[PDB]
């Protein structure tokens, strides 16, 4: 069992929650023609079926490392955010992008608006969560929050969660007013 | 205040070998920092993060190479190592033992090669190595190309 400070810090730095608030369905991208590979069955995050120009928000603190605008092929307009501890999030098929490459990002900050750009198959946000470039189960991160803290800990094939929370414990330790007098 | 110590867990600072701290309490590359030291000197992470790459190989003349990925676009490289005691994907603390110095790869004599990068771009390591609790303004003073305004404000809101 973890303390509240560890939990809170984790939920600031690692993608969690809903990056789009209005959607009518959530569907693995595996079930449609993949935006680049153009076939079904590719393990590739999720799609939110959602109206055009719904705001999209950053799912954790970070920095923007890549943006496409004025694109109408493949992923279409996109934002990629690099987070702490090797995680990244990608947001695709956007109608408008609000952020620039190399800008710092806060959790919940507006990064764009959903659209149908690229090989979208209609209006939707495409969303991925990666760890050192490897594709994860995004739904485990969507469902993750302070009251339901187990959800992302289930994605543990590549990720050593105990090790992560030990590192986080070394950070949250510092809120106690101490130490290190020889 | 609480601000200071918190920031120094996440953004690389100080010397990654102990005897260069004890002294500081060392020649530049093009680019990075070479610190001459006997084989098997312990190498410590200058901030917390994830091991982005522990590569046992030639790595273009770097020899054995650790890349640590820190929050907010920062990375540290630790090269010419004799041995590496972390795996790719492992999470490490500020100050944690990650490797032992060596003379592997393209090296004229035993030393640690240390780099600090911001978004895969090299920046002066001496600005971060001489950054410490006493000399706290130093990295903000000497490294103006980083938008410290945006970054510090964001790091503060973590604390809450
Ligand atoms: Zn060198």
Numbering used by the authors:
A (entry chain B): 123 to 304
B (entry chain A): 129 to 153, 165 to 299
Extract from the study:
The overall structures of Csd1125–312 and Csd2121–308 monomers are similar to each other, consisting of a helical domain and a LytM domain. The Csd1 LytM domain contains a catalytic site with a Zn2+ ion, which is coordinated by three conserved ligands and two water molecules, whereas Csd2 has a degenerate LytM domain with incomplete metal ligands and no metal ion is bound.
We have solved the structure of this complex using two different sets of data collected from two different crystals at 2.27 and 2.35 Å resolutions, respectively (Csd1-Csd2 dimer I and Csd1-Csd2 dimer II in Table 1). In both heterodimer models, two copies of the heterodimer (AB dimer and CD dimer) are present in the asymmetric unit, with each heterodimer consisting of Csd1125–312 (chain A or C) and Csd2121–308 (chain B or D) in a 1:1 molar ratio. The four Csd1125–312 monomers in two heterodimer models I and II show three different modes of metal-coordination in the LytM domain: the canonical metal-coordination (for both chains C in heterodimer models I and II) and two other non-canonical modes of metal-coordination (i.e., non-canonical coordination A for chain A of heterodimer model I and non-canonical coordination B for chain A of heterodimer model II). In both non-canonical coordination A and B, one of the three metal ligands (His169 of the HxxxD motif) does not participate in the Zn2+-coordination and an additional α-helix (α1a) is formed in the linker between α-helix α1 of the helical domain and β-strand β1 of the LytM domain, making Loop 1 shorter than in the canonical coordination.
